[PDB]
């Protein structure tokens, strides 16, 4: 029963000190993944962790949005739980204490957890171990034996743990059938957006 999480291929070097510490746990597999999203880590089939800087939160993009606007909204498409880790310099608490509540109200959402951390590695490592212990899983079971069927879920954009989580309970056909019958166990694996992507696939007429 080895718990498994995924790290974003683009953020490995930034997180290399975090990863070095986490991988001391002989009961954790860290899978490097290429996936839609700016999140640093994927804790389970529908939980990601995304580290942002408080100091950049109010910088404007060329298209008129704030720095992290589209990244956060994109993650909310794929993850039922989006955990936002906000690094800030302690000086902010004395020089600009309004930023804390502004950020938390701006991001306020039942599917978004926001935690402020200092810029040190220890803080992020400790939150990560907390997230692993609370939300990560092993994926020992496998009711789908055909790797091409996993490619199908991967091409729909499902991250690899959502695929493993699905293939724990269903073969691909059973999953299709359970979504077509709106059985709650299958439906609650997905976001609204993943649910609509899938129904499009099952509903497109030749």
């Amino acid at each position: 029963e080895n718990k498994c999480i995924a790290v974003n291929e683009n953020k490995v070097i930034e997180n290399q000190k975090v990863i070095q510490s986490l991988c001391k746990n002989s009961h954790l597999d860290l899978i490097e993944q290429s996936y839609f999203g700016e999140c640093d880590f994927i804790i389970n089939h529908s939980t990601c962790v995304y580290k942002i800087q408080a100091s950049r939160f109010m910088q404007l993009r060329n298209n008129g949005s704030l720095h992290y606007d589209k990244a956060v909204n994109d993650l909310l498409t794929e993850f039922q739980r989006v955990i936002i880790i906000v690094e800030f310099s302690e000086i902010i608490q004395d020089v600009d204490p309004d930023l804390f509540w502004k950020i938390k109200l701006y991001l306020l959402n039942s599917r978004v957890d926001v935690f402020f951390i200092h810029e040190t590695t220890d803080f992020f490592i400790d939150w990560m171990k907390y997230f692993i212990a609370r939300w990560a899983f092993s994926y020992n079971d496998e009711k789908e034996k055909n790797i091409a069927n996993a490619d199908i879920l991967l091409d729909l954009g499902f991250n690899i743990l959502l695929v493993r989580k699905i293939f724990q309970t269903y073969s691909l056909e059973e999953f299709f059938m359970a979504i077509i019958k709106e059985e709650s166990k299958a439906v609650k694996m997905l976001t609204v957006s993943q649910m609509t992507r899938l129904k499009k696939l099952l509903t497109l007429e030749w």
Binding site: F36, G64, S65, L66, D69, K70, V72, N73, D74, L76, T77, F88, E90, Q93, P97, D98, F100, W101, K102, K104, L105, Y106, L108, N109, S110, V114, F115, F116, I117, H118, F123, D126, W127, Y130, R134, A148, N149, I152, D155, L156, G157, E173, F176, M177, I180, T191, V192, S193, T196, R197, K200, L201, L202, T203, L204, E205, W206
Partner: protein
């Protein structure tokens, strides 16, 4: 063993997020703070005191809000614990608040979300309704949740053809029968059901 918070007043921040109710609770922490420095020698011993105090506050504040004529109803309840003084770093408060919530099993944990901030003179309900970037962020949030960018994915037809040939192969369906069957069932939904029921 005792309640060191002074909960001053509960107000709503009216226009944060359409599917949630946001309560702002002003907590005077002067009494709590003087317990720490005056009568706590070690950080470890003081951590457990703060955790206990935090569970008392959470329970007290949740309970007060449930007796008050405010109907959370379907909407998510988020409770903002607004401290007159933080003394230590917000980052330790976020840790301690989460750890305290992790121990609670009663309704105050499952019925609400919490976050801590420091009191300031700025009016937050005015800020939420004046800030355009905030408004733009929520509109874009709902547009992206309810839309599928089909360009970011590969052609659905490639996947559908794959499944079709698999079903037919799986169910003993010769090529000379493909046509009749695809003319009976017009999408994967119909086709898959016809093969498993």
């Amino acid at each position: 063993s005792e309640f060191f918070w002074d909960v001053q007043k509960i107000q709503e921040i009216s226009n944060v997020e359409e599917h949630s109710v946001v309560k702002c609770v002003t907590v005077n922490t002067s009494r709590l703070i003087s317990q720490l420095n005056e009568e706590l020698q070690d950080e470890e011993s003081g951590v457990n005191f703060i955790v206990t105090q935090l569970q008392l506050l959470i329970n007290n504040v949740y309970e007060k809000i449930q007796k008050s004529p405010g109907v959370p109803a379907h909407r998510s309840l988020m409770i903002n614990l607004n401290f007159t003084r933080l003394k230590f770093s917000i980052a330790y408060w976020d840790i301690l608040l989460e750890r305290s919530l992790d121990l609670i099993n009663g309704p105050s944990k499952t019925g609400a979300r919490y976050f801590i901030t420091e009191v300031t003179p700025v009016d937050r309900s005015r800020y939420v309704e004046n800030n355009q970037y905030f408004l733009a962020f929520k509109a874009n949030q709902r547009l992206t949740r309810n839309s599928v960018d089909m360009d970011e994915f590969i052609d659905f037809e490639i996947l559908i053809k794959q499944i079709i040939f698999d079903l037919f192969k799986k169910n003993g369906i010769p090529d000379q029968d493909f046509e009749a069957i695809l003319s009976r069932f017009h999408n994967l939904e119909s086709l898959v059901v016809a093969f498993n029921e």
